[PDB]
Amino acid sequence: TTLLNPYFGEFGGMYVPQILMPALNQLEEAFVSAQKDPEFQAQFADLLKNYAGRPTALTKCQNITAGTRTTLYLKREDLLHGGAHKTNQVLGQALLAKRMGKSEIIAETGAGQHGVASALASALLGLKCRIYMGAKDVERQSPNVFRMRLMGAEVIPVHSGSATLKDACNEALRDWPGSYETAHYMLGTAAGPHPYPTIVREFQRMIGEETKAQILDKEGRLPDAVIACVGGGSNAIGMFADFINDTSVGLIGVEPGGHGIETGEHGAPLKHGRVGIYFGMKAPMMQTADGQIEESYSISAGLDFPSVGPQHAYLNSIGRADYVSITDDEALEAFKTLCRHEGIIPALESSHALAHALKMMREQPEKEQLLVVNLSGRGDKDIFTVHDIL
Amino acid sequence: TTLLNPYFGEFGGMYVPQILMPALNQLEEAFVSAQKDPEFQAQFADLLKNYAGRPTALTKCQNITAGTRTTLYLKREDLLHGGAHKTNQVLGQALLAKRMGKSEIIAETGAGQHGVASALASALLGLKCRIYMGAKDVERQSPNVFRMRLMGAEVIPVHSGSATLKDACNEALRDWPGSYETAHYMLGTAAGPHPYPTIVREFQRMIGEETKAQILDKEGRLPDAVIACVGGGSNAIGMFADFINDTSVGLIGVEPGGHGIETGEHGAPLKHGRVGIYFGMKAPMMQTADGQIEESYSISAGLDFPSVGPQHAYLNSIGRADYVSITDDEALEAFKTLCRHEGIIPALESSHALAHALKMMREQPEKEQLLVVNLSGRGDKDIFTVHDIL
Amino acid sequence: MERYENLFAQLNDRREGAFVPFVTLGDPGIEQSLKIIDTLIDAGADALELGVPFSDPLADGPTIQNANLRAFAAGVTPAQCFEMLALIREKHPTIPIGLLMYANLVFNNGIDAFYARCEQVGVDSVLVADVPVEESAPFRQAALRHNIAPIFICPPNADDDLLRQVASYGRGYTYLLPLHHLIEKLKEYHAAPALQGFGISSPEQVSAAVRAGAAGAISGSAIVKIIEKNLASPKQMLAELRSFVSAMKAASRA
Amino acid sequence: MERYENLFAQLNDRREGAFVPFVTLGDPGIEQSLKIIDTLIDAGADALELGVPFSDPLADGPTIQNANLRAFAAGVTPAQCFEMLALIREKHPTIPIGLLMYANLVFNNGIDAFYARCEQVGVDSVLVADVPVEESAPFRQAALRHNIAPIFICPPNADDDLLRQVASYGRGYTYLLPLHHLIEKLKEYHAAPALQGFGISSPEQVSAAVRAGAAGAISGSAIVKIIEKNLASPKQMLAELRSFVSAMKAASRA
């Protein structure tokens, strides 16, 4: 029994061991209750405005587009507190954990930005936060590991399987059945078992709501297409949700194509993998031919989640959004173009979204088109990766 | 002859070689003209809102203050584009250089944040930017040097004298007499020859104007004291200016006390140095007993300018603001308290301001007091200095 | 399913509990695992519960996770596992054989296809670790079309609706994770007989499970720690697994 | 001031320009600098313009900046410089001696105090490099109370108000940075006689300065490059400075 539907056409579900069903049902109950509670809605709004710094700007990029009939805006989740959009939905899930009377947070992290997010929200809101991070990723993400510790969180390295993000997601799912009476699992994307894909969409949907009011204000009409990178799907489904019922607006998600699709070293399971059941849900996965789960490759460490949210797989299957890919060198090019022509250093995750917009403009430079790219975070943290490559 | 007064009581002036007076008079003319020009005012406002992300939040820190009768807000210039408040006045001076028909920008930088600022503003606004940085500082600020280059700027190392910030300020003043017909000198603090202390105050004064409207809104009355760190004086005079005529509001500036005043290794020339004439102005300097200029020491690289703005020296001499100091370990303590209790990593420059507020609360914990600290930037860039010390 | 009905009827004629060890197929290699399993059986295991190595075992603890690591270090795949099973069965026609599967491995190439391959090699039941009763319909239905028992865990705080579905939907045995109450409810709802699992790691828990009214006990990971401990002497590993299983089974006797 | 009035009157009786070299006091050490200066004088310098090392010479180019570096590598201070000056003067009673100062060094211990110390050791003029006419009042006034000439630069695009203030406010000479027009204006306003500075680095510019109507020429940094080049042989450094100065001064003659 559930109160809301766990599936998006065939994708989604609750594929977890039986002993975790009460945790999910309790969390779905609490969330439905909070979404009807105006004191909750005011509490959330106020941290997002006076703590996180919403709304965030929508910036027109006129130097980029000169000489073409593309007008491009960038929605500036890189100016949110912590540097990426992941801060909006951790403040919401922290407040839901306090609503349920919980005092502790579990979270998983790959490149470490969800760990940083979840540690800041726990510090501000008085929760004791422990974070699982695969050991290969802790070794390569020192700056992130130390920010999480500065902010009070316990960082636990995970050495099993591949010692990367899927392995810490397994370790979070091992802990929570013994601790759910007092700890909340703050899952860090729009994926995993129901009700997480719903919760995280609804706690990110203000990116798209602010984009609509800001574009109407500045251009008097909605975008031709709104473009977002897709690692597990939260910043993309947060920009798309308010525009799904506006059928003229294109929704385009961009997966990492790594070294190239045809190399097999990429991260694009929505268009290039195969549906499987893992982490709680039925959705496209990076997996071997006999069913073992594999890792996603990108130059961008944040696009490492080896599946995708099930609402993305559903909106692709009915054709209301389209999904493409962008390779490592396409992303690196767009990150350099943006620094030198607009003074904005973007995250190499976001760079994937901007690359695809730059190809939509450059292949057909006299097509009139109004594009928004979700600039999901800033790119201070990439400047030495982009240093050493070049 | 000038149109506005170059002095603040005895401090200030135009102590530059004669061949640079026409550059300063031209710049003062242009600025007076722009401050009366509503199309200029709209142009500035719009980049600060849709590019830089104004207004910035004013966040209440309730975990910090618990158990005392201090209420503390932090004005969140750390959420501005680029990470520190220096972005507001570079967008204004870039627009003034375009008003005068110039196509090129000169700037000086120490720890490199003014260089990063000035490179982003030049990229966005189509100016060719070259930056002087003393060679010891380029060697220790790689991440900053590469951001400036990613953004298109020419970074020129300066090997003369001490090869730090005073030496690049000398090199900027050498270049500008040969190039002022087409290049603007974008000075990076509220100091130097007139009209820079005036211009930079007026292009930072929105920090204090937004603080007043935001505090009135949230508490119904003005602060007891507003507290800001003082390296050369721009973020402090930008928070103080709108409150100078509100005589109940305390204005407190905090200089770096380094290893301790009594060690002599600090950066507090306003309370601990001696008036001299250098960089264009008469103001308190770090200098030897026979008049040679010396460097300012702090654990925070940004509080390195070895003098202070002349409006600070004037407001101290008439007692309308008070100035104090905070040592390296006081700053480091406040940077850790803020990360772990509020989820905010502050710049170690800002940490100096927060340290002094934390002592105003902890020495007299039942004194009712409403404090605002200007959190002039974020502290991602300090996490390894704060790593290795501890 | 038949083979468990026969087994529990035989045990009940003897007033005896069942003792069911778990191990991972191919740990620590295929030929070594074939001999550990012939050892568990010759020492008195009443049925086997066997694991197929899967990359992300999000419902297993450290002991098992390290079992899969050893099995993958030896190259073990699901295909190799089905070969293994057909040999076990050919060698031992009556002992019930269950699998402990992750969902992806069953859904991979088609869930009906999976249950038909278990029915061809002679598996008698399948517990899928990450499919709860709420998502189990296609799994149960396909197990049942191929004469395979779908097994479900009855967790420790199982509320009454969960009791009734686990009783209705499972066959073979109930994997049972106050006890005397869980157990009496399952019998009331006519559930498959209950095996106590988890922590069964010495003789006295076997005995106490039977005395609470369960049909038997499952040793979820103690057999695995004996392999892990004896990796350097295959012969000593067999001996200590014979000793341990002999005593657990001694304890189920009346 | 007296000594420059006497000098220009003498030069004019000879229809001759002045040649004025610059050097930094103590470059590359005190005893070496004393001998370079006795060399400039014996080779024919008509007056000297001398620099006191200052940490931040924001109106000097590379050659001079490196002169101050060598002087500070030898420990040179303003105090040592005033000792130096008193010796130069005691040895040479008529040659005019000017200083090139940064403001801080004059304002340090009291601007009146500075001009009284120059008047005690026998300096005749002071140009302060970063004080423009708009900020010069306390400097000029104090120079003038102590019989010291305040010298000002007349920059190349000097507008007419600047011409008139530089003429009114300077004494000794005008440091002149179309030429024939700047020069005729300065004479119209009765300014101190003009020395062409900057780039005076070979004989023909001396000659041309005098022929444009200037009273003389100043070699702002060519003497300094000859030190820099000969640091490894003090004796060769003297010779080449004698050769160069002899020819510059030859060129001012009629």
Ligand SMILES: *Cc1c(COP(=O)(O)O)cnc(C)c1O
């Ligand atoms: C993590 C991250 C992403 C990827 O996760 P989604 O859930 O797909 O949004 C994208 N951009 C940034 C800046 C990130 O930190």
Ligand SMILES: *Cc1c(COP(=O)(O)O)cnc(C)c1O
């Ligand atoms: C540079 C800097 C300061 C110091 O300069 P001011 O002119 O005194 O404001 C302070 N905070 C930050 C974050 C800086 O980058």
Ligand code: NA
């Ligand atoms: Na993905």
Ligand code: NA
């Ligand atoms: Na200072």
